[PDB]
Design a protein around this ligand. Structure first.
Ligand code: NA
Length: 321
């Protein structure tokens, strides 16, 4: 799953309402993609709101009741019948009531359950920064700072390969044949990128996903908001690789369940996968996911290696590149 479509906020209203939640426009505006009017995954957005309101992600089972369907039709989210159904699971609420005494009241009144105090509050996306039920697969950054945009032209020019696709923001790459896929109207290939890589795009030896996600509240948030970009661009980019090709993507780890699953699904498809933070990468949370040797071999993926590298990067124990 994890497909992007339009009108996800509208489709989510009835799901959210099972937990007494009623999002105003200003509150919706704290969801990345809302203000910019871009397509998204309803599930990823639900997950984000589940954490923000109740301090728990979807793997808690909190919205596992098959109450309200979420379907995609004609690139639009809606509530037509589907095998993917969600809604407040009252049994889970009761299962959790011992540990979280006011949680039943939170989900009855659509207020935020402050996981630090146990008290209810008005919606604010800074109260519950991480899902307390999730074993985070790697360390997160404590200190994030304002850095100028990283330049990866040096990094990509040194990858093995002749034909290159840069997806997203413009990037000159000295020494190679570079095509540019973007929403900017002068790109080699032009389209909305929130709905994914257009199927008519050719095949390439290297694809570089040069797309970033704004840091607003926390490394976790940043990660979550980039997940849909991993799915719609990075993962879809694997269908546009020649045998043995390479996909490199800007990323922030996989603090959230979706990113972890998407990166896993991408890693399985390559001989080699690694995570890098070159000297040119200033933003503390930023990393490059590096997938080399695309092929059609069936594989498993142990996340220990990438996860350990991520932790070492974000805690500062890995040598500087
Ligand atoms: Na494969």
């Amino acid at each position: 799953q994890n497909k992007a479509a339009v009108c996800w906020a509208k489709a989510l209203v009835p799901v959210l309402k099972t937990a007494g939640i009623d999002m105003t426009t200003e509150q919706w505006n704290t969801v990345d993609y809302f203000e910019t009017d871009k397509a998204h995954s309803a599930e990823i957005v639900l997950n984000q709101l589940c954490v923000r309101f109740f301090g728990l992600d979807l793997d808690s089972g909190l919205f596992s009741a098959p109450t309200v369907p979420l379907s995609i039709r004609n690139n639009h989210w809606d509530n037509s019948p589907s095998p993917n159904m969600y809604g407040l699971n009252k049994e889970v609420v009761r299962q959790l009531s011992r540990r979280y005494p006011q949680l039943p009241r939170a989900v009855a009144t659509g207020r935020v359950y402050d996981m630090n105090t146990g008290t209810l509050r008005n919606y604010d996306p800074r109260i519950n920064l991480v899902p307390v039920n999730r074993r985070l697969p790697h360390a997160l950054v404590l200190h994030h700072n304002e850095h100028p945009q990283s330049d990866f032209s040096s990094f990509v020019s040194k990858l093995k390969g002749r034909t290159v696709l840069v997806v997203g923001e413009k990037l000159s790459v000295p020494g190679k044949m570079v095509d540019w896929l973007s929403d900017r109207p002068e790109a080699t290939f032009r389209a909305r990128l929130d709905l994914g890589i257009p199927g008519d795009v050719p095949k390439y030896d290297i694809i570089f996903v040069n797309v970033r996600t704004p840091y607003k509240y926390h490394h976790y948030q940043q990660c979550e908001d980039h997940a849909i970009k991993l799915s719609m661009l990075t993962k879809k980019a694997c269908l546009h690789l020649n045998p043995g090709g390479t996909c490199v993507s800007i990323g922030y780890g996989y603090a959230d369940r979706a990113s972890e699953s998407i990166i896993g699904a991408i890693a399985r498809q390559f001989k080699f996968s690694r995570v890098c933070k070159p000297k040119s990468s200033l933003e503390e949370t930023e990393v490059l996911f590096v997938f080399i040797g695309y092929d059609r071999k069936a594989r498993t993926h142990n996340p220990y290696k990438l996860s350990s590298t991520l932790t070492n990067i974000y805690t500062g124990s890995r040598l500087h590149e």
